[PDB]
Amino acid sequence: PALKLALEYIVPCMNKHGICVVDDFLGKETGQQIGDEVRALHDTGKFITWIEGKEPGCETIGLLMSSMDDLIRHCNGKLGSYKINGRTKAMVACYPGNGTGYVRHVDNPNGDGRCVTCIYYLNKDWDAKVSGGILRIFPEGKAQFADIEPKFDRLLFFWSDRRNPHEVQPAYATRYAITVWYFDADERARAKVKYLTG
């Protein structure tokens, strides 16, 4: 139900707030397989990494990416004025439970093409009250900020640029999550001809 999901919620939610939470994305079963695939790769190398989506043992990881893409397609270029004509590979990251937080950062500070951050969380039965790991985002122009749990099967969207500085509180248990960044056509273009010449 991506067409309706995209147009009725994602688009207006992102255009109005610059952040959008979509719980219960792929359902429990689908998430567990992805969870297992990520764990397998972490525990032992196949042959902080980048997954194209077609690799052996990364099939359900690829499904997530296609699903994610599908939602973006069905936004039909209504996410701001962005023309999304591609994206990064999937960053499968392991975030430790060693009492370290991540310092407030902007994902895309220097206009490198990446216009939308998209994070899928893989932390089953996660309770931030015991395990921490809260994401705090500060929408630039707003009187409020948002604490967002890294809850299992949650999909989060937000603008990668200076509109969403974000920090992550410390965690006390290992965490898994998959991040993709969706490119703006004009911005990635400008960044390419900036790195060379510019």
Ligand X SMILES: N#Cc1ccc(CNC(=O)c2ncc3nc(N4CC[C@@H](O)C4)ccc3c2O)cn1
Residues of each annotated binding site for Fe cation:
105, 107, 166
Nearer to ligand X, 8 or 24 (CB): 24
- Nearest distance in Å: CB 171, ligand X: 7
- Which residues make Cβ contacts (< 8 Å) with residue 96, sequence separation at least 6? 171, 174, 175
Nearest to 123 by CA among 23, 32, 187: 32
Q: Which does 151 bind (CB under 5 to 8 A by kind): Mn ion, ligand X, none?
A: none
How many of the chain's residues bind ligand X (CB under 6 A)? 10
Q: Which of 87, 90, 166, 184 binds ligand X (CB under 6 A)?
A: 166
Secondary structure percentages of the chain, helix, strand, coil, to 5 = 35, 30, 40
CA 41 – CA 50 distance, rounded (Å)? 11
Is residue 154 part of the contact set for ligand X (CB under 6 A)? no
Q: Which does 175 bind (CB under 5 to 8 A by kind): ligand X, Mn ion, none?
A: ligand X
Instruction: Say if residue 57 is exposed, middle or buried (CB neighbours under 10 Å; 0-12, 13-18, 19+).
Output: middle
Q: Given the DSSP bridges, would you call strands 102-105 and 90-95 parallel, antiparallel or unpaired?
A: unpaired
Q: Retrieve residue 111's tokens.
A: 């206009």
Site track 66-95 with ligand X (rule: CB under 6 A), x = hit:
-----------------------------x
Residue 117 near residue 157 (C-beta atoms within 8 A): yes
Q: Which does 95 bind (CB under 5 to 8 A by kind): Mn ion, ligand X, none?
A: ligand X
- Which residues make Cβ contacts (< 8 Å) with residue 75, sequence separation at least 6? 6, 7, 10, 11, 84
Is residue 168 part of the contact set for ligand X (CB under 6 A)? yes
Is residue 107 part of the contact set for Mn ion (CB under 5 A)? yes
Site track 123-142 with ligand X (rule: CB under 6 A), x = hit:
--------------------
Is residue 116 part of the contact set for ligand X (CB under 6 A)? no
Nearer to ligand X, 11 or 90 (CB): 90
- Which residues make Cβ contacts (< 8 Å) with residue 28, sequence separation at least 6? 152, 153
Nearer to ligand X, 31 or 150 (CB): 150
Give the interface with Mn ion as residue ranges (CB under 5 A). 107
Give the interface with ligand X as residue ranges (CB under 6 A). 95, 102, 107, 119, 121, 150, 166, 168, 175, 177
